[PDB]
Amino acid sequence: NLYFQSQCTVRYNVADCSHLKLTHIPDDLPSNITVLNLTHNQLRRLPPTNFTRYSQLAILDAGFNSISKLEPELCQILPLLKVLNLQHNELSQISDQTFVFCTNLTELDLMSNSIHKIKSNPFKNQKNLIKLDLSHNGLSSTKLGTGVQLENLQELLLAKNKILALRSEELEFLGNSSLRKLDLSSNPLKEFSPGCFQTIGKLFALLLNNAQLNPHLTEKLCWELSNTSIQNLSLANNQLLATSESTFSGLKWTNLTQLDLSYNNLHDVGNGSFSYLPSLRYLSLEYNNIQRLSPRSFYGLSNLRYLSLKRAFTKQSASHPNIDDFSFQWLKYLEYLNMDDNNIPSTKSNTFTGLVSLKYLSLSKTFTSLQTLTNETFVSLAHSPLLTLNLTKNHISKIANGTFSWLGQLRILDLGLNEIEQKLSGQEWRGLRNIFEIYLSYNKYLQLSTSSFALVPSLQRLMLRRVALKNVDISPSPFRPLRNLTILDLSNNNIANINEDLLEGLENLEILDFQHNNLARLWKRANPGGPVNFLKGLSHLHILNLESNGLDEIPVGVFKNLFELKSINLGLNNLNKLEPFIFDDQTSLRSLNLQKNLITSVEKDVFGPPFQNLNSLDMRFNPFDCTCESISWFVNWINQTHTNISELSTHYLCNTPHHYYGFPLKLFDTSSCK
């Protein structure tokens, strides 16, 4: 799509003029503008005179053009300039006089230009520069001056260049400038001269992603990083195939906080390799090939508070990863441990010993040979105040009675996307006196029973999507004990029969999702038994979704006294007949969806009440009757209501009476009908 039209859509002092194949600078624009998003055009230069119209510009974005030369007069003509952007342009030379007049500049970007060299003090007048960018413009020396300059610099970026080493002298121009992010990623460094980083005033973060490092190189690097204030350090995308004690020997004189080692094919962690980081707090090990772990692998990290292991262990191949017991006895303050995407065979009897502060534990798709959660696979976690356990995608097939007898402090439990297939006798949840949510969606099937949920009265949420439930109509209802339940998602299970005892006593329920369950027959005027009213006394219902159940007649009385309903979704059904006064008690309705039905007439004795305060209505794809007797009131309401109706003009068509087959509803003439 396009419709970029001729002139650019000018807005409130933000004149975006992207993708217009411009060649000149537009001048007609008001003199009160502060922004010029000139991105994505084919300009050749910026004459500093064609901007005399508006000396009110604040930020200039001229990225994605073919600018080859800037002029010093541009700065003085635009004295209120703060941010400049010239990425993906074709500059080649920066003279000593170019940036002389720009002094209110704070951010300056020159990313994909071609400054192969710089030999001057061109940033002298830049006492307000905060974020300087030079990433990917083919440089070969980090030197940008000879005296202490850029006093208030804050975020320097030098990615994708041809820097070969960091001389001690070619960085001394940062004597008293607090660098808070020094990006140097993807620079083929080969040497770190002594004093290379100590010369900077303050250094906080440092990015050396894709810098082709090796253990020797990073050893020299770390020996040159000591005795500074570094706090974040990343080493992604390297050849750090191994580590030992001497690898990070230099880091002992720093208050390091983060350390990223992702994407290194890190193969074997040496014994005590982190003994020198008693302040590390955020560690990553993602996407590597750790073969084994020993109780010395994490020795000394007595102060960690986060750790990721997502895809950290070797692949499946007959080579299988092996984390031996007592591996985490040192991480006495750890609280989060992601362990997704691994191939650990199963949990041993002491794996998580000593983790007396673990709170959040994820295990999504970490196992290959579990298939059964017995009462001993979690004995190692008996001493951890857990608050979450993500266990999706493990091909779990069955659970034993009292597996979770240990996690007496758990809140959320995730069991979705497995092959659980058993009768929930109710003893599986033994001990979870503090459970708060349980996630069972996407399993094979479960056979509920009267005493299934009796052991977890404090439950508050419950998800049973696509689980193909059975034995759902049993008295008393298995849900009766859950006095504190609020959400229910008993959806996409295909429930043929719903005894009306279900949901009795769940007074606190607020969300009920009951889609794709083919409960059609239950609603009937033919009534083998009196029309079911399972929505008996849930007075706290807000959103009730009964979509795609082949409904064709809602009994009168099912919505009686549910005064707080906010959204009703009855889409994808066969409703055509609408009993009078079905929505008499729904006055707070804010959302109503009856799309994709067989409704032919929209009368007032049904839709008045809900229409009285509606904010959003969706009733498209319906064979409306285009006669004033069937739609006159509706069309009037459409003419005089402020409700948000989506796709009004195109998806409200009458399939009758041919004289109007295709006629837009809103266009229906109503005058001569009374």
Added chain:
Amino acid sequence: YFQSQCTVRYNVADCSHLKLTHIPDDLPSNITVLNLTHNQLRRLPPTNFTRYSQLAILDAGFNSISKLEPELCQILPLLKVLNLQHNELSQISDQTFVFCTNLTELDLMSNSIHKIKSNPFKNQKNLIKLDLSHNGLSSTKLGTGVQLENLQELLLAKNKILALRSEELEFLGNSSLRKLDLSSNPLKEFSPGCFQTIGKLFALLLNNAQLNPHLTEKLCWELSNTSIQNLSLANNQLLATSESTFSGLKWTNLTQLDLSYNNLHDVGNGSFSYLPSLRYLSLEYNNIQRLSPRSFYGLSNLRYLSLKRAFTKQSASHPNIDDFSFQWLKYLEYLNMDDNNIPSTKSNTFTGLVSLKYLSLSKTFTSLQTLTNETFVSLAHSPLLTLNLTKNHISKIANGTFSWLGQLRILDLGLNEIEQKLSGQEWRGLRNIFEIYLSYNKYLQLSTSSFALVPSLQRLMLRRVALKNVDISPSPFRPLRNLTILDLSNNNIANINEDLLEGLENLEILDFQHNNLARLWKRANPGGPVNFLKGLSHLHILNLESNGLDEIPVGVFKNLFELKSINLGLNNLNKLEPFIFDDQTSLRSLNLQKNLITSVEKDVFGPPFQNLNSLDMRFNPFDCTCESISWFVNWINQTHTNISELSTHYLCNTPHHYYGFPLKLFDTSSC
């Protein structure tokens, strides 16, 4: 959806899928058909049909009928065809079919007649096609005297017949059976005289009958000395064959023989020596391991043969057809050989095939990758007329590979990995070529002398081949004086010199889609607007879809008086130069869907609209003002042209007061 009283038609009252329980009577008395298929009827009282004694064929399939009445026949004396499949009948008494005599076809397929003991078909002297397939029978006996004199097509599939007694078939003494279906019956015995007892037997189907070489040997020894012409043996355990396997067939004028789906493993030496009249043979979906020059010995009269998926799979076990394999099939004319794993063609494989005309090789090879000047020496003595060679991963051809097939007409080379510069010598010798199929290859580099050696070409397909070197003078297509179709489509042609297509006076179809030739058409004109459609006066259908066009030059359609279809969909046309279609008066089809057209004026669309039969211009941001669409909307109100999806896909995206307004609903009076 829509159900209601069934949609009655001209004396054909279809009332399917209505969950009926009674028989409708309101229907006229001039009806001849009742398609009562797919309902829930329990039975058919022969009195509720008294209304119309004019019925001719009754279709009561897919119901729950449990009993019919003899009075039904006499109440409906003009009944000819009956159908009761997937019903639940259980017993056929001697009096049920007594009054039906004008019956010709009778079907009782999925009923439950576990037994029949009477002469119930006595009054059936007009029965032609009787069906009893899949109703749980255990004896083919249907009577005791010669009955069903004019029977013609008997079916007995999916039953529990265990053998064919000589006596339990004698009720067909003088009835010419022309199709005796017995598929999927676990036969174990063939008593002597089993088939000779029938008057005449022409075809016989024994599909899925669990046969073995011994069983079929006894069968064939009991089939001799009859008039059988077609015989099928699909889906069996015929794991091997020898000379004695078909020893009995020597006394028959057999014509067809199907052996598909048998895991047929090894053809014995001379195993077909007894069929000097076989004319249509099949061997599909088996596991022939090897072929010997004796494998087809004696079949001196064959005229068709399929080998699709006949050879063993890839596994290190590879099929091997040795040389001189077809020296006996001196009258063969068709040979399908799809889906095999023959490594390559030897130097004598097709020797002796001096009558082969149609040869297919679609996906038969695995290790060809190069068609040299010797892979077809074995075909030097065959008047071929087709060669299907798709899906062989061919990578390159040598000069003069086709120097042998001097009588070929159609050549198929699509769906391969051909990647070379067509120097022009590849087609050496094809002085009679008629069509060449090159679509779906890697890429070809054309040259001035590419097609110079095949002047008699008439069709040419170059779809998705990613052409290069297309603008060279003179055009490589210039020599093809007889070309008619061109399909130079989906190749992305940046530059088209206007010399191309000059002299192809006989061209009728040009397909030029998905080629992003946008720039060529331009008013800015680096060079004068290209007019490659210079003098093709025989053009009928011209498809230039999806090329990012935004301005057609004036003069490109001048004097092409026979154009019948123009497809300019999926472009960026918004501006329409006056009088672009002045010479297109015979236009029958016009497609301008999915464009940026905003106004439809008369000085452009008058002429084409004058005689149009079909127009497609949907998905366009029409201007809903009478100045832009008034004439169009009037024409829509007063024209008989076929416009598809008129009422829903012709919406104005302007001027908001009408955003979404159906075009046809646009009021025009006050303009």
Added chain:
RNA sequence: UGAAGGCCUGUUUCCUAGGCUACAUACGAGGGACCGCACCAACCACACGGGGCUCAUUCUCAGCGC
């Protein structure tokens, strides 16, 4: 010259991604004889949009070297 880039056009691939189709299979009702219809679900197939990426040959830079 080569190398390098932003502008429009579009070619291929990749999914994701939706809807619609089509197929077997299943849970149900209801009728029925000793196994045929409606609702629903998932399944895979087919057609077509929609989201990323990778090529095209044009419109124009520079930096030259000589």
